[PDB]
Design a binder for this molecule. Sequence first.
Ligand SMILES: *[C@@H]1O[C@H](CO)[C@@H](O[C@@H]2O[C@H](CO)[C@@H](O)[C@H](O)[C@H]2NC(C)=O)[C@H](O)[C@H]1NC(C)=O
Ligand SMILES: *[C@@H]1O[C@H](CO)[C@@H](O)[C@H](O)[C@H]1NC(C)=O
Length: 287
Amino acid sequence: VIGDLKCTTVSINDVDTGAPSISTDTVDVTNGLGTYYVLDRVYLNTTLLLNGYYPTSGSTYRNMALKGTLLLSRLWFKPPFLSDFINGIFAKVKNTKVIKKGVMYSEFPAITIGSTFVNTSYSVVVQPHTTNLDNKLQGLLEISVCQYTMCEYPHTICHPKLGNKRVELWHWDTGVVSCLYKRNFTYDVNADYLYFHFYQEGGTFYAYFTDTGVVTKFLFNVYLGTVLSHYYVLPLTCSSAMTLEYWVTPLTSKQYLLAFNQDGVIFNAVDCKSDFMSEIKCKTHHH
Ligand SMILES: *[C@@H]1O[C@H](CO)[C@@H](O[C@@H]2O[C@H](CO)[C@@H](O)[C@H](O)[C@H]2NC(C)=O)[C@H](O)[C@H]1NC(C)=O
Ligand SMILES: *[C@@H]1O[C@H](CO)[C@@H](O)[C@H](O)[C@H]1NC(C)=O
């Protein structure tokens, strides 16, 4: 279970469907993938050695995405799906596109990051929303940090047009919920992949995002005064069959070599300590 409130009793079983699959491709940071722009700092036509919360080049991704229709397993809401959140995570999220009657729909999983997922604690929720306005799909990423009464089996649903056997049910709060942060961010419904950095430092949670390149940009930060310990990528239920991807690899404090072009755009990155060839590159001066 995620939270400790039973929100549903309909079509819940104890079926084992397998563990999260591992990508055949490892973490590759060469083009800037896995890095983010430095907050309030513009570097132009230069190379920079700096410390941040980065993935490790050569390491693996796990596909944490879960998709069902009606039947949901209790095991989907336990480890290894419910996972540890230490320093942070880097995410490569597939924007699954589905076309029905001339309308393209955008679908990908929501994620929650918290400790106990009980309303005596704050939980981070990053959830997509879509609507069709004048035959053109609009997309929003809703990010909130609230004392949610999270459900035991939290899940989202697809756009109503694609068909649903279940209702959206990931928390249950009929009163006023205390939130430290909440707002909507736009996302490109036509993007192939969305990239995220989520990390914590000195009691402060940070979020970075992009869907227009491979280098993420600062969205927001919030002071919690506590340490987050777990993350969970929520199942998405839909009557339409589709394949979802939410690739996750951990972040740790690492020294990277970043290359910025004349416009201040990151075009190259080296994970200095990932192997000896990278160590050579970083030892050869550059800041
Ligand atoms: C972000 O945008 C979404 C979608 O417009 C907002 O969610 C709606 O909130 C209203 C008022 O509470 C409800 O009547 C709708 O049912 C909600 N729609 C959906 C799809 O959830 C949300 O309030 C916005 N968040 C913030 C922080 O402004
Ligand atoms: C960029 O920096 C390099 C040194 O690494 C220098 O040769 C070049 O003149 C600079 N270009 C611009 C447009 O400032």
